[model samples]
Target: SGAIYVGNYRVVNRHLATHNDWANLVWEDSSRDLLVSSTTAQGCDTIARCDCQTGVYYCSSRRKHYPVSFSKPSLIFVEASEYYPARYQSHLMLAVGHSEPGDCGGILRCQHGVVGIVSTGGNGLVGFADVRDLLWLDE
Candidate 1:
């Protein structure tokens, strides 16, 4: 029988301090337009970013940041906010992946092993993506 599988793991850094404050998820649309957004509550002051195509996610509570963009369609940024506990604010970005050689839809669905994060600036954080078979997230 086929079953749904989910793995839970914690991240640890031995060299430097780890501040895992926010979580963000980004995907692509049918039009290939990049969409960047976030979900943060006034109570929780966290920051996260992602590049869908590259499957990159970045998070931190530090100030002085810049936006990250891909060669084609992807972008991420940081913002200011109030600090709170037990509250979470998520950031989101969207980009369209290239479809198959001649697919009509022009939509690049989410594929397995297709999630990750990259840092373009100083001490950039890690970006997380859903690396699994089939289309996991899209809009």
Candidate 2:
């Protein structure tokens, strides 16, 4: 082949986690290694490092104060975009602060902060989890 260099992959933390058991899709390939190139010609950090807070507010038919839990997300603004979520959903969202979603793998934000990724499509409601801290992924 006529090639000087096969365009290298600045293997970032190449083997940070080889067992896709940690990621579940990588272990299959020996080169499940991670790559880190100067994306955007240099960037800040990542969404995983974004600072986020819990317990903004929530609503229940029973009338009790239930803030958004870091573990269990109950409200997904009907107006969430790719980057930042709408500060408020319906009038009920800001006023009573409630209302709940689909399309798995979507990003979940909390008051302008990255929370976790949408994990499943639901009936009564959808659910999401912080992939890094997910259960059953442990070895």
Candidate 3:
């Protein structure tokens, strides 16, 4: 319950959102400022720049491509892929109500910009963590 490894980022403590102080920061030791201290790395993308206050939201992948129609939802559903067959099936996503995506951690975006990263979802539900919840930089 202390650490969660996702792609290149690592989620340490601060996983409690119920208290409202939901901070989903990437532990410094994980990326070691690699994400913030370099030229445009293909890994992180300026957190995409958005908020969770929109009725329309969108997410993209190699295919992704939804709505709450946010009730109840973003930029709306957008494309997805990998060209490969089995691999593609194993790597793709959509809204919870639309279908069940693979593992945790997908960038949840709004029409204006990105809102959060997918954390958990199932049974027609979803969740995420803000750009590290307005995180801190590595020292």
Candidate 4:
């Protein structure tokens, strides 16, 4: 867990596991601090931003985008890229979901030819059809 204060809000980074380098960001005290925008790398030359306002979180790639909704005074989870992929270059794969009151295990992926999400403990592949059209190319 890592905590950093941004203006009036506190941004906390939570490392879920090490296998796939799964992590998420939490905004402490949702009442005052709201996540305005989160900048993430889509590739070596691309950048993506996740915008949050009111009770909704919005993110997208080149052709695909997704939106998530939550109640006020809530803690949300937002993820971009894994550890390995982010070391050499950056990529954008936005996954947003509830975290404080409940854990929904939010996940996302980018469509670039080869795509995968490493599961640290599980031995099954979970797929979501909701984001199938959301493919951000690294160009």
The most accurate candidate by TM-score is 3
lDDT of each: 0.24, 0.30, 0.33, 0.23
Per-residue lDDT of model 4, residues 27-113, tens digit only: 211221112112252223211223322122212211223333322222223223442222211122223332221121233223222
* Winning candidate number (lDDT): 3
Whole-model lDDT, candidate 2? 0.30
Span of 10 residues, lowest total lDDT, candidate 3: 30-39
Off by over 4 Å in 2: 1-102, 131-139
lDDT string for model 3 (39-124, tens) is 12233333434333433233332244344333211112222323112211111222344333442344455554444444334565
What's the CA error at residue 86 for candidate 3, in Å?
A: 32
Which lDDT value does model 2 have at 95?
21
TM-score of every model? 0.18, 0.29, 0.38, 0.18
- Give the alpha carbon lDDT tens digit for every residue of 1-139 in model 1: 0011122222111111123311332323212112222224222211222333443222233322223333332334423212222222232233332211112111112223223222112223322221222232221
Candidate 2: minimum summed lDDT over ten consecutive residues — where? 1-10
- How far does residue 85 in candidate 4 sit from its true spot (Å)? 24
